[PDB]
Amino acid sequence: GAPATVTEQGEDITSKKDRGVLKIVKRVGNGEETPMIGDKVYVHYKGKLSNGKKFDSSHDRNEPFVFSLGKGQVIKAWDIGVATMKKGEIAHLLIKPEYAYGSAGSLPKIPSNATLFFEIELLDFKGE
Ligand SMILES: COc1cc2cc(OC)c1OCCCOC[C@H](C)OC(=O)[C@@H]1CCCCN1C(=O)[C@H]2C1CCCCC1
Numbered sequence: 482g483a484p485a486t487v488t489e490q491g492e493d494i495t496s497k498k499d500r501g502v503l504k505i506v507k508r509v510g511n512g513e514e515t516p517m518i519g520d521k522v523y524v525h526y527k528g529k530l531s532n533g534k535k536f537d538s539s540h541d542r543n544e545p546f547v548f549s550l551g552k553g554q555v556i557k558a559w560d561i562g563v564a565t566m567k568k569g570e571i572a573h574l575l576i577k578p579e580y581a582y583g584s585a586g587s588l589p590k591i592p593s594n595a596t597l598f599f600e601i602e603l604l605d606f607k608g609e
Pocket residue numbers: 526528529530535536537546554555556559587590591597598
C-alpha cells in the first residue's frame with residue numbers, strides 16, 4: 482500500500498539525493514507559490530511508522546497542526562516536504578530515520594532507526 486508505493490514511485494526531494502525523503506502528490510493544490518522558510522503553515526496529517534504499528538492524526542486533535550517552516554519545530558522531513566507543497570495539496574511522504582528521529586529515536590513513541598510515513602494536506606500558509 483501507500484508506503485511501498487512511495488518507495489517505488491516517489492520523487493526524492495532531498496538536496497543530497499539520498500532518498501531520505503520521498504514524495505508523491507496525491508491531490509494537486511492551487512497556484513504556483515510554495516511557502517518560504519519562516520512562513521506560518523497550517524496542515525492536516527495522518528502519520529504512522531512504516532511498520533504500520535502506530536498511527537497518529539491531527540484529526541485526533543480536531544484542529545489543524547500549525548508550525549513555522551524551516552525553523553526546526555518539526556522533523557527535517559517536514560521542513561523539507563511542506564516547503565515543496567502548494568495550498569490545498571495533499572502529499573504522501575516516506576522518511577528515512579536521518580530526516581526523522583535518527584538512531585536515537587524518541588521513545589516510547591518512536592524506536593531507533595524508524596522509517597515514517599505521512600499523508601499531509603497543506604491548508605494554508607502566511608508570512609511571519
Ligand atoms: C516524537 O513525539 C511525537 C511524534 C508525533 C506525534 C506526537 O504527538 C502527537 C509526538 O509526541 C508529542 C509531540 C512531539 O512532537 C514531535 C514533533 C514535533 O513531531 C514531528 O515533528 C512529526 C511531524 C509533525 C506531526 C507530529 N510528528 C510525529 O513524528 C508524530 C509521529 C507519531 C507516531 C507515528 C508517526 C508520527
